[PDB]
C-alpha cells in the first residue's frame, strides 16, 4: 500500500517541478528517486479491471531513464518525459479504481486486487517517500497503533433522522406534548411543544430533553448553539404515529428556559453549558444531551393571554427549541464532511462503472445507512477506499 502513495507524490512533485526552465540541481534529489522506480518496474506485467463495466486493460513496461543536460532543462527534455508520465497517469487511475471497489468481510482492511496484492510484494518497497499527505500520514501511524486523527468542516456524524415523540396525546390530537427533531450531518434541531402551555404542569413548566448518540467520538469540536428551532416554528399537518390520520401543529415560540447542553463520553459529562448560546467547545464526546423547558409566562399582555386559555380548545401551541451545529471537529475514524470529496469520489467511481453491490457497503454507498451501522469492517474498508481516493486526487480530479 504505502507503495501506491509514492507512485503519486512522485508524479505530482514531478509533473510540477519539471518545467521548461528550472535548473537541474533543483531536482537532483528528485530525478534520482524517479529513475529508481522505472528500474524496479520494467518487466513485471499487470492486470486491471474484470468487474462490472470496468475495462480490463493490460499494462506492460519498457522505458529508458532520464538524461540530465545541465543548466536548466530544454523543452525537448520535457516532452520526451511527459510522454512517459502520461502512461503512469492513465495507469494509476486504472489501478486506484480497481482496488476502490473490491470489499471483504473477514480481512477487508488489506489489499484485494491482483494489481495491488502484487504491490505489497517486497521487491517494490524500495520506493516510499515524502509522506506529508495528511491521509498517508495517518495510514502509517495506524499500522503501528497510536493517536491518529483527521480534520473536518461541518462533519457528517448524524444519520438522517426526522421524527417526533408524543409524550401526551389523544385520538383528536388537540392537546399534545412532546418533541420533534431533525438530526442530519453536523446539525441537530429539536423542538419541545405543549399545547396546554403548561397550564396544569408543576411550576407551570414542562421539561424536554433530546439525546443524540454519535456512532464515533468527536474531539476538539467547535459548536454553534442557538435558541429556537426554525424548522419547527411553522404550521404543519403531520402523520400520526400509527399512520392512520394527521394532526395539526400550530406553533407559537417562547424562549427555551433552563437550557443545558451536556457532551458526554461513556456516560460521563465532559462538557456542560447552561444557557450559553453562540460558540462553545466540546472537547471529547460520544453523546449530546439537550435539556430545555417551556415555562408558562407568569405575566401576559392581553394579546398573549388570549393565546393560552384555561380550557381547550388549545389553538396556539407553545413551542421552545434549540439548534446545534458542529462546525468542525476531529475524529479518529474517517467520516464524510462538507469539504472533502472522498465519499463522493468513491461513490462516483462505483456508479460510473456500474459496480455491483458488494458484501460490505450499503447500496449506493448510502451515507445514512453507512453511519447508522458503522461496523469495524465498513470503517476499515472505508478508510482504505478513502485513502486511495485521496491518492488519486493528487493527480486526477
Amino acid at each position: 500500500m504505502d507503495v501506491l502513495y509514492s507512485l503519486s507524490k512522485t508524479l505530482k512533485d514531478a509533473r510540477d517541478k519539471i518545467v521548461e526552465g528550472t535548473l537541474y540541481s533543483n531536482v537532483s534529489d528528485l530525478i534520482q528517486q524517479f529513475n529508481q522506480m522505472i528500474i524496479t518496474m520494467n518487466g513485471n506485467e499487470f492486470q486491471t479491471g474484470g468487474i462490472g463495466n470496468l475495462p480490463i486493460r493490460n499494462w506492460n513496461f519498457d522505458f529508458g531513464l532520464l538524461g540530465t543536460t545541465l543548466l536548466n532543462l530544454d523543452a525537448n527534455y520535457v516532452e520526451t518525459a511527459r510522454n512517459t508520465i502520461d502512461y503512469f497517469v492513465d495507469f494509476v487511475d486504472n489501478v486506484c479504481m480497481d482496488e476502490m471497489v473490491r470489499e471483504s468481510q473477514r480481512n477487508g482492511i488489506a489489499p484485494q486486487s491482483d494489481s495491488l496484492r502484487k504491490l505489497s510484494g517486497l521487491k517494490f518497497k524500495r520506493i516510499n517517500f515524502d509522506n506529508s499527505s495528511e491521509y498517508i500520514e495517518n495510514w502509517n501511524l495506524q499500522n503501528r497503533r497510536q493517536r491518529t486523527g483527521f480534520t473536518f468542516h461541518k462533519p457528517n456524524i448524524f444519520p438522517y433522522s426526522a421524527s417526533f415523540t408524543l409524550n401526551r396525546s389523544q385520538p383528536a390530537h388537540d392537546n399534545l406534548m412532546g418533541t420533534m427533531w431533525l438530526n442530519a450531518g453536523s446539525e441537530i434541531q429539536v423542538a419541545g411543544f405543549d399545547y396546554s402551555c403548561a397550564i396544569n404542569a408543576p411550576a407551570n413548566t414542562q421539561q424536554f430533553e433530546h439525546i443524540v448518540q454519535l456512532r464515533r467520538v468527536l474531539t476538539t469540536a467547535t459548536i454553534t448553539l442557538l435558541p429556537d428551532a426554525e424548522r419547527f416554528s411553522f404550521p404543519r399537518v403531520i402523520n400520526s404515529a400509527d399512520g392512520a390520520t394527521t394532526w395539526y401543529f400550530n406553533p407559537v415560540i417562547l424562549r427555551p428556559n433552563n437550557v443545558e447542553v451536556e457532551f458526554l463520553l461513556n456516560g460521563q459529562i465532559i462538557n456542560t453549558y447552561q444557557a450559553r448560546f453562540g460558540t462553545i467547545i466540546a472537547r471529547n464526546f460520544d453523546t449530546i444531551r439537550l435539556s430545555f423547558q417551556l415555562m408558562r409566562p407568569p405575566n401576559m399582555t392581553p394579546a398573549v393571554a388570549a393565546l393560552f386559555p384555561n380550557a381547550q380548545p388549545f389553538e396556539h401551541h407553545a413551542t421552545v427549541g434549540l439548534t446545534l451545529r458542529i462546525e468542525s471537529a476531529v475524529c479518529e475514524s474517517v467520516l464524510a464532511d462538507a469539504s472533502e470529496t472522498m465519499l463522493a469520489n468513491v461513490t462516483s467511481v462505483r456508479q460510473e462503472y456500474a459496480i455491483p453491490v458488494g458484501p460490505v457497503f450499503p447500496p449506493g454507498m448510502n451515507w445514512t445507512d453507512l453511519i447508522t451501522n458503522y461496523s469495524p469492517s465498513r470503517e476499515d474498508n472505508l478508510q482504505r477506499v478513502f485513502t486511495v481516493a485521496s491518492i488519486r486526487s493528487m493527480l486526477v480530479k
Binding site: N35, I38, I39, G43
Partner: protein
C-alpha cells in the same frame, strides 16, 4: 549503445540483465560466425554479455 558509452552506464542494463530480463541493443557492432553444432548446445551466445 552509442547513447550509453558516450554517457557511462547507470546499470539500468545491469539490473535488467541480472534479473535476467528480455532486452535489446541498437547500432553497429563486431559479429562472430561459428559452425560448432555443439556450441549452440553450450548456449555460448548467452555468455559474452
Amino acid at each position: 549503445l552509442e547513447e550509453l558509452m558516450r554517457t557511462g552506464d547507470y546499470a539500468q542494463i545491469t539490473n535488467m540483465l541480472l534479473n535476467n530480463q528480455p532486452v535489446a541493443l541498437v547500432g553497429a557492432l563486431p559479429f562472430v560466425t561459428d559452425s560448432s553444432v555443439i556450441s549452440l548446445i553450450a548456449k555460448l551466445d548467452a555468455t559474452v554479455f
